[PDB]
Design a protein around this ligand. Structure first.
Ligand SMILES: [Zn+2]
Length: 257
């Protein structure tokens, strides 16, 4: 079983998942002096239907907000993509303290947390399960979260956590459009990469926003007070779930700006 502690964590993952030492691993440090501006990149277009919001789940290492993905009610288009990608989930990563917590870094700078909005290629594939292992199967928008002012758009999500405190708990989570969590500028970086935890498939086209969103110290505390243990066991707070940055191995990070 994999996690984030020292026995089962990022430095150990290569034992059952050798792709952890692959050539297209994520996250990465984005060095802005080494990025290549690409005039061919189109604007990012998101069109999400709040009716697709389904469920919030404590998954032990994190929590997930899942969406109905049976049709194209909620889609990502544009950027580097010719295909339409269907929303299926969003989640966050965070760290032990405010000083770290993001997965991607920019010129070496670590942010406090990171939002991931994940989609699958419904133009080419019939299901998430099919798409997840294909090079062009997944598209994830990453948004760096900078500690500062409380973010009111996080409210519904944070209010839901009291109902899913321990591992395996789940609740309906409905009528929510996660494009409300995105920054006002959708200027972005893009590079070919991977899932940031097992199974670590190199199936993700990353879209990293240039503009951060805010999160308060107390909002981050709410993430960290989720519990990784099952109900009735000794409490084990979910202190962190960010992977260290990985070698670019010659990949190019492109800029839309
Ligand atoms: Zn993630």
């Amino acid at each position: 079983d994999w996690g984030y502690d020292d026995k089962n964590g990022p430095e150990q993952w290569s034992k059952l998942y050798p792709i952890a030492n692959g050539n297209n691993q994520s996250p990465v440090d984005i060095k802005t002096s080494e990025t290549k501006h690409d005039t061919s990149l189109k604007p990012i277009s998101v069109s999400y239907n709040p009716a697709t919001a389904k469920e919030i789940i404590n998954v032990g290492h994190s929590f997930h907000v899942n969406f109905e993905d049976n049709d194209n009610r909620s889609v990502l288009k544009g950027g580097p993509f010719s295909d339409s990608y269907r929303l299926f989930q969003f989640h966050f990563h965070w760290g032990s303290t405010n000083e770290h917590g993001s997965e991607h870094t920019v010129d070496g700078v670590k942010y406090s947390a990171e939002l991931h909005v994940a989609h699958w290629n419904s133009a080419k594939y019939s299901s998430l399960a099919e798409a997840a292992s294909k090079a062009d199967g997944l598209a994830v928008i990453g948004v760096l979260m900078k500690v500062g002012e409380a973010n009111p758009k996080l409210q519904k999500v944070l209010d839901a956590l009291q109902a899913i405190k321990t591992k395996g708990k789940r609740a309906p989570f409905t009528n929510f459009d996660p494009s409300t969590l995105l920054p006002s500028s959708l200027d972005f970086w893009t590079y070919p990469g991977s899932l940031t935890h097992p199974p670590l498939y190199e199936s993700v086209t990353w879209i990293i926003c240039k503009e951060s969103i805010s999160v308060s110290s107390e909002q981050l505390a709410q993430f960290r007070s989720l519990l990784s243990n099952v109900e009735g066991d000794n409490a084990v707070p979910m202190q962190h779930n960010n992977r260290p940055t990985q070698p670019l191995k010659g990949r190019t990070v492109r800029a839309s700006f």
